[PDB]
Design a protein around this nucleic acid. Structure first.
Ligand code: FAD
Length: 456
DNA sequence: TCGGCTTCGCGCA
DNA sequence: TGCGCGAAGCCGAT
């Protein structure tokens, strides 16, 4: 569909039909940004070919009642900034509330849209809304992978067992798909308040806030400023100040040496392709660059591959056969400790390291990358069953992580609990052959006491 | 039918 | 601290 700097492999047709005479509508769900957005760029070019304006629509669903205020404010503040950025390019933004299967279909008929475009997400609920929209529209419907450097349907046609199988396929396609982003051309043709939605949502989630003993909320919202502009600053400071030491200190939670890009990446407020562009371009430690690129290319996009080809990505069924057989045989093993969801949530276990990790999660909304494994694996060790462990880890992850409700989270938990994209290890009690992590193992890798003292 | 697996623990300089 | 081995099942190159 036209374009010179436009790889057609990034766009797939969800529904064919006659192209209407109205504006092209970009249904934005996952990539909430104005710059470095292939889905937004693809909508602009098609609208340019038909001599029609492009508009962006966002549907606020009821799914924010399952998470907390920390994610709601972070997303809403970014949308307010994105609304002004799109208005400067004469691109109006419409914010709907309700079921997208009904609101998008009503919007497309009322505004007489000619072409519908949306970004890609392998999550189950996104596919359900797509199927409802297809059944309610008669105009072409397109889907664009704006989140991965290589389109998810292009990197692999099947579920990938391990990184070492998926790595050569991704890197082989890098010279074709790693490219600079063209500038978003403003519209040539012009034709609910987010403040009220922010106020209404906060009041609804206020009773379910995470409070302390003296009725003070735990969340500290000054650690990550939301928005597309603030995402850019985080990327710059990582390359200038932290990228050099990333390879050596990525597994040290006492050192702030991570990129801290996961909140922005999850909400689409910054493009991982843009980050990869800047990282590939910087002169830094070759070991550190390879260590970071593997996280943001291999492990990030293989989490999409996992969720896209495994509809039960959040269930015990998706675990590899050796893992399911191992965990099943140890179901009757006596657990040293058994904690409920409430006890896990409040950090009331016998392990100060686990409790400290939970307190980082509650107070900052971003647990360090290394402790997230120890956190999830100890949940498996101190729960009734593998099923109860999975649901507890998923519940706590999505409720308190800024980057939660994400394919990285589900693949990250499946790695820790079911050994997905992992291999078998020493046979043990309760965890079977799943990779084991111990408190003493953390002690020899970083100052555990400093991490504990930082979070009580 | 071998080689080597994100990210393990553990003994040893 | 950094290094090498152990423990374990399997994909993918042939
Ligand atoms: C049990 C568990 C749960 C997790 N929960 C989430 C989650 O809810 N959401 C989320 O985005 N990630 C999650 N992670 C993956 C990873 O820990 C985070 O991406 C990382 O901690 C975010 O911090 P960072 O961006 O500063 O890390 P960096 O080291 O700077 O990572 C750079 C980027 O690479 C990607 N990445 C890094 N590590 C991984 C990984 N292990 N798997 C996949 N992609 C990765 C992310 O996009 C990340 O932003 C989880 C991992 C585990 C083991």
């Amino acid at each position: 569909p036209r374009g010179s700097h436009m790889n057609p492999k990034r766009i797939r047709a969800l529904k064919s039909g006659k192209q209407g005479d109205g504006p092209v509508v970009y249904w934005m769900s996952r990539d909430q940004r104005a710059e470095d957005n292939w889905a937004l760029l693809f909508s602009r070019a098609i609208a340019k070919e038909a001599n029609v304006p492009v508009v962006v629509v966002f549907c606020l669903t009821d799914e924010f009642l399952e998470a907390g205020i920390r994610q709601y404010e972070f997303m809403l503040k970014g949308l307010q900034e994105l609304e002004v950025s799109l208005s400067r390019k004469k691109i109006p933004s419409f914010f709907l509330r309700g079921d997208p299967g009904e609101k998008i279909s009503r919007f497309v008929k009322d505004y007489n849209a000619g072409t519908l475009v949306t970004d890609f997400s392998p999550l189950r609920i996104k596919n359900q809304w797509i199927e409802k929209v297809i059944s309610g529209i008669s105009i072409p419907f397109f889907e664009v992978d704006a989140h991965n450097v290589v389109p998810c349907w292009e990197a692999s046609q099947k579920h990938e067992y391990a990184a070492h199988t998926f790595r050569p396929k991704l890197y082989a396609l890098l010279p074709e798909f790693l490219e600079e982003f063209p500038e978003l051309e403003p519209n040539s043709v012009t034709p609910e308040t987010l403040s009220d939605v922010l106020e209404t949502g906060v009041k609804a989630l206020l009773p379910e806030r995470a409070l302390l003993k003296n009725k003070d909320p735990l969340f500290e919202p000054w650690h990550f400023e939301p928005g597309e502009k603030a995402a850019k600053k985080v990327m710059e400071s990582f390359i200038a100040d932290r990228l050099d030491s990333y390879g050596a200190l990525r597994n040290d939670p006492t050192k702030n040496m991570l990129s801290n890009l996961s909140p922005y990446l999850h909400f689409g407020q910054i493009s991982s392709q843009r980050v990869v562009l800047e990282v590939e371009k910087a002169e830094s430690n070759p070991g550190s660059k390879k260590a970071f690129l593997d996280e943001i290319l291999i492990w990030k996009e293989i989490s999409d591959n996992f969720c896209y080809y495994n509809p039960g990505y959040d269930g015990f069924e998706s675990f590899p056969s050796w893992a399911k057989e191992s965990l099943n045989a140890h179901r009757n093993d006596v657990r040293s400790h058994i904690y409920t969801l409430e006890e896990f949530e409040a950090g009331k276990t016998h392990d100060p390291l686990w409790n400290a990790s939970q307190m980082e999660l509650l107070s900052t909304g971003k647990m360090h990358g290394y402790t997230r494994m120890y956190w999830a694996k100890k949940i498996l060790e101190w729960s009734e069953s593998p099923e109860k462990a999975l649901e507890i880890a998923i519940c706590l992850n999505d409720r308190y992580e800024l980057d939660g409700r994400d394919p990285n989270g589900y693949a990250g938990i499946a790695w820790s609990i079911g050994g997905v994209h992992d291999r078998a290890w020493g046979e043990r009690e309760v965890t079977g052959k799943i990779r084991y992590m111990s408190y003493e193992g953390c002690k020899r890798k970083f100052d555990v006491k400093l991490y504990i003292e930082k979070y009580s």
